[PDB]
Amino acid sequence: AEWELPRLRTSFIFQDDYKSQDLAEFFDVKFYPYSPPGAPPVFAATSKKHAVICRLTQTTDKDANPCEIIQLIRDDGNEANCASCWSKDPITDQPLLCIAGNEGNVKVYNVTEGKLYRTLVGHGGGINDLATSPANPYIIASASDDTTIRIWSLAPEHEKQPCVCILGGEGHSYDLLSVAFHDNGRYVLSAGHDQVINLWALPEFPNEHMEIPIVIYYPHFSSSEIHNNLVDCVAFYGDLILSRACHEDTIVLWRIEGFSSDDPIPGPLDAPTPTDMTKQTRSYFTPSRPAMFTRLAQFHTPDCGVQFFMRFRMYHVPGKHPILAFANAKSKTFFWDLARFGEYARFMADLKEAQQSYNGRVVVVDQGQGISLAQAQQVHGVVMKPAWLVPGFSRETLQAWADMYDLSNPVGLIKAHRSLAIDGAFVGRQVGWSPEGEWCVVVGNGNRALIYQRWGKERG
Amino acid sequence: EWTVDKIASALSVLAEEVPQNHSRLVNFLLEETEKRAPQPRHLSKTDPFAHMKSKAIDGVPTMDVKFKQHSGEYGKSRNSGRRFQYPVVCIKPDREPVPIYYFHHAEIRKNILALNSQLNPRSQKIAKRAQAEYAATLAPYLEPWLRKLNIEGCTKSNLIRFMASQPESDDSMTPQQKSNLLDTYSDDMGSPQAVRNASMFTEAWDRVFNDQSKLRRVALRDILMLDKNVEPIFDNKRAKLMQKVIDALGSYTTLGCLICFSHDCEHGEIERDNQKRCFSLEEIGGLMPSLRRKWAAQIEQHPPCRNECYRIHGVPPWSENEVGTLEWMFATIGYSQTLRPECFVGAILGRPCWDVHRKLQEIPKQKSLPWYDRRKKQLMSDWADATITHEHAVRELFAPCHHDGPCTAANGCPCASAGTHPVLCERFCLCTAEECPLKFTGCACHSSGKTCLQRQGRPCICVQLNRECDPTLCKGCGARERADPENAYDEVLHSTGCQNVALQRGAAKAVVLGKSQLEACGYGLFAAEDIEEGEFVIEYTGELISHDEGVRREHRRGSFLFTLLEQEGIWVDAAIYGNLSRYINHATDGNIMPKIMYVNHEWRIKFTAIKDIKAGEELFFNYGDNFPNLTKKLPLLVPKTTQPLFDPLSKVQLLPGQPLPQHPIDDSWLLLKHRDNLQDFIDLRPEEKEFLQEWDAFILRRHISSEQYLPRYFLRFVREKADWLVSKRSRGEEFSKLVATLLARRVLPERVVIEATQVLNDARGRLRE
Amino acid sequence: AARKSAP
Ligand SMILES: CCCc1cc(C)[nH]c(=O)c1CNC(=O)c1cc(-c2ccnc(N3CCN(C)CC3)c2)cc2c1cnn2C(C)C
Ligand SMILES: [Zn+2]
Ligand SMILES: [Zn+2]
Ligand SMILES: [Zn+2]
Ligand SMILES: [Zn+2]
Ligand SMILES: [Zn+2]
Ligand SMILES: [Zn+2]
Ligand SMILES: [Zn+2]
Ligand SMILES: [Zn+2]
């Protein structure tokens, strides 16, 4: 069961709302993260003018619809939107949906009652991304065409001046596309059209009124060298970094040398400053390789072409396999299960071990069936192979396996573990995962949502 | 015996562990990350969506959704799909966005000096980055592989020697770079076989890892340049009885600003490669021309210390540092009557004064110019045609004159002759007012009322020259007190005396940011108090940039650059760093007027009111030709207004009659940059950096431009840092070199060296604890 | 050249 990957279960098209009769798109999708464990998962899909809110329920009937639309909100202003994140009312604990777009304001909607909670005003240009802090659900970050990040607090003490921090200075010089929080809520990644990925350290914010935001002028890590193109999606994976750029058809996994979230958070005066204008990378963290970062792996995502503003999403949850998902610009949805890499390495080591210890004469038995490495040994008086490794073995088979699972070349291309075709011409913009990982929703152009499921309950 | 083939063969085998270790590393990191999966936080105890049912319908706005169901491994549809109608909840926002802007706009107290920036062949960029990553990957394998191969003469050091002796090092290196290498490594490579082995290893390395067909390739040379004893050699961030003292003070003579007294500051000139010439003692001839003049001015002419003073009296062996300390204090105190090294050196070292005393003994007449009388302090006759002193747009910047003779063309005086006309000699020229008829002497104004005004029986020469009064030279008008920022809000003081110190005073009129009244403008700036015609309003601050830097910024921003010195080529850019004056809009009938001013050897831009302006009215000036296209040429209250007004940082809307927000200027980011600048000099010792950074962090926050105010700030520094200074021997020694350098400039009165002697001896005695 | 909207 734990090795199951999703399959297409439901899809829908939301009526064109940017009329030209089909150039509307869903730009974002996000599952609500504050529901009690086991509750039916709920996501919001954000089009240019609407927020579409759906609950997903598993069905025993293959023909029944698991998706039901429980709230539909229109931005009755002039803004076209493309970013969303969830927060909560700090008094009532009701869900709050934040929505931001090309006029540079964040609208915070009380979604169960269908009213506005508040607006967050201050940015000098359109907002292209929002993220909520995992450590504090009242803290949200916005990334803007004005080249800054603003950090906002919905806590009651900050009602009269809710911008608690600005990430400014000269770290970025063009429109930002992507902002992300570390799980500890104190490190922020930003990136965009200037091809710079920046890591910033947030101070602690006082639990009282702040007449002005704290301004941070210097990131603690900065580099334009991981990609050679505009960067439109970044995220932490634990302490590791995932990012992708336009024209590269990869998602890059990499790390900052010397960065660990077990260490104390550095203060703003620890940041490096641009003393030398020829350095395209600088880092507070530099302690092994002499460099300040190490490229680790590249997930192959073919046929993104020249498209940008396409985002991936990792499902990372205790006790479940981590799954990377991404849809390209030619009607494909890709999945990688990061737990397959280790089990394939273990199996390749078990194979080569017994090949020497027995002069090339070993037997290979699939896992998953009723046979143990014990019952199998009772027969010949033996290597266990994961059942998902599918064809000694032919060179073409070993080549196919290494393309999917070999992690030995940082500039290699790791082929998707599952590749699902999409009918029609479709460009993926965003991926979201339900809390229990049984639903994966891809949204994109044509106002289309693709809903994938595993661990279903359908029967006959 | 080795061959290139045998070495290359063994390198290929050793190389097999690189991807093996990479796979182990990524798998380890992936496994650790999976184990650290975060538990979801802040869960509600109840499901907030539980009560909400589908809004599908069995005069409200309505939208369609069509669903399709899928099953199987291929996602085949079950049918063509079912369509539903949904009511729409329409939510209007309650606030408009603020006017548009780019970058975070941060306030600076004074202009700051920018470094030149790069504009970021593409195919060469990509390939070099790929090679740099591969070089960094392979570099930690070189020494373990060398130890495994154990070939005679195949040593990291011997491979570096081989590299430096190859022809490719005439392209990749330069003289002195070869010198620094052969000082660390020399050229002896050992036995003939050791030389041959090193050569074969290099060839075999480049054969295995530097294949020309590949993009990801690395020459051994590339790996050797990453060596922490090699890379510094290719790093050009370098700052630098009498010859002993000259070299002892070299860091201070080289980096110490003549204007603001900091060692990393906004003055000086940035060269094309971002090397900096500081506005330094070294730009006016180094230590000796100023010191010799000090000695001569001395020849043409109290209580004992509490440290067992030699004047009443008269032991651990002295180190070289201690005798050196006594030498340069002696040389720069010079032929003094009232100050002598003993007491001060005694407080610097931890020694009794009688000890250091025991160790111690152990004018061609020149015709005055017809257009300027420096004794009456007056310009005369065709002075506007005879000089360019007042004409900042055509001025070129040359080092203050430090020649030996009269200030004439014959002696190469740049003041007399470097420009199209003569300019007056300024306060940093080594000539004196009695010798040199070009020496500026300040203005002669005095009055119990206002003075040094534009529309004045005798004009103010400072006003005529488009300069502010000098706190030292203009003695009659009270500029000494009015140019001191500690008196900036003494309205009684400033109601009389010198009215020509506004930029130094540093007080601006109350202004507030808002939405401009002009359609097609965004922000504007509004008066927040009444302003009389003729009053100073605000300074235009920003980044000081070169012409080519201006063209680069115009390109990268798809731009308003204020011309400060046209001929010299300096522009002010307030796109990111500046103050509220960056938001003042253009109108041909403006109510304020910018003007370039000479201010203690800085050029700065002031705005003056040309009409009466009432609180709440928007400010305008005629942009005129101040903003050229460089590429093409190649209690205080929020006032009542119709326009919305904004806090500059929070962008929160201000309400009429509320206290006007005035946020103190945040400069810690700027102090950090200047500290790091010093930290990056390869030729400064750590004991030098520690002191220079402590002094700079203090003195930069005081924004000095006149030596009139340095003695006071110097005494404050010694008092605040006295415990720190006596806690560590190197800090006293470095402090004494600063003192020696400022005594040599005759910029530090002897009086404060005596008091600092008391202050240090006190702190030492208090430490005795 | 990079493109943001759908093709
Ligand atoms: C540093 C001085 C700031 C200032 C001064 C005054 C008197 N009044 C002001 O309002 C502001 C504040 N304004 C700026 O900061 C600033 C604004 C604009 C700008 C404005 C309006 N519409 C567009 N466009 C139309 C749509 N297009 C797709 C792209 C954009 C763009 C472009 C800018 C700005 C700074 N740099 N740039 C470029 C060169 C990168
Ligand atoms: Zn200076
Ligand atoms: Zn004494
Ligand atoms: Zn001269
Ligand atoms: Zn001169
Ligand atoms: Zn002179
Ligand atoms: Zn005067
Ligand atoms: Zn004067
Ligand atoms: Zn005056």
Residue numbers in the entry:
A (entry chain A): 7 to 25, 34 to 301, 307 to 400, 405 to 414, 489 to 557
B (entry chain B): 196 to 253, 261 to 322, 360 to 479, 492 to 552, 567 to 579, 587 to 634, 647 to 740, 743 to 844, ...
C (entry chain D): 24 to 30
Give the published text.
Polycomb Repressive Complex 2 (PRC2) is a histone methyltransferase complex composed of core subunits Ezh2 (or Ezh1), Eed, Suz12 and Rbbp4. PRC2 trimethylates histone H3K27 (H3K27me3) to mark developmentally repressed chromatin. Ezh2 contains a split catalytic region composed of the SET domain and the SET Activation Loop (SAL) but is inactive without minimally associating with Eed and the VEFS domain of Suz12 [Suz12(VEFS)]4–8. Pyridone inhibitors bind to Ezh2 in an extended pocket that overlaps with the SAM binding site.
However, humanizing mutations increased GSK126 inhibition and allowed us to solve additional structures of humanized ctPRC2 bound to GSK126 and GSK343 that revealed drug interactions for a model more similar to human PRC2 at high resolution. We were also able to determine the structure of hmPRC2 in complex with GSK343 and an H3K27me3 stimulating peptide at 2.3 Å resolution. Overall, GSK343 is recognized in a similar manner as GSK126. Additional electron density is present for the longer propyl group, but there is a lack of density for the piperazine region of the tail, possibly because it bends in a different direction compared to GSK126. Despite the structure being at a higher resolution than the wild-type ctPRC2-GSK126 or hmPRC2-GSK126 complexes, the humanized loop region of the SET domain is still largely disordered (compared to S5A). Notably, GSK343 is also a poor inhibitor of ctPRC2 but produced an IC50 value at least six-fold lower for hmPRC2 compared to wild type ctPRC2 in a manner similar to that observed for GSK126. Interestingly, while the H3K27me3 peptide clearly binds to the aromatic cage on Eed, the SRM domain of Ezh2 remains disordered. GSK343, UNC1999, and EPZ-6438 all feature long tail moieties (respectively), which are potentially solvent exposed when bound to PRC2 similar to GSK126. Comparison with the GSK343-bound hmPRC2 structure suggests that the tail of GSK343 is likely pointed outward when bound to human PRC2.
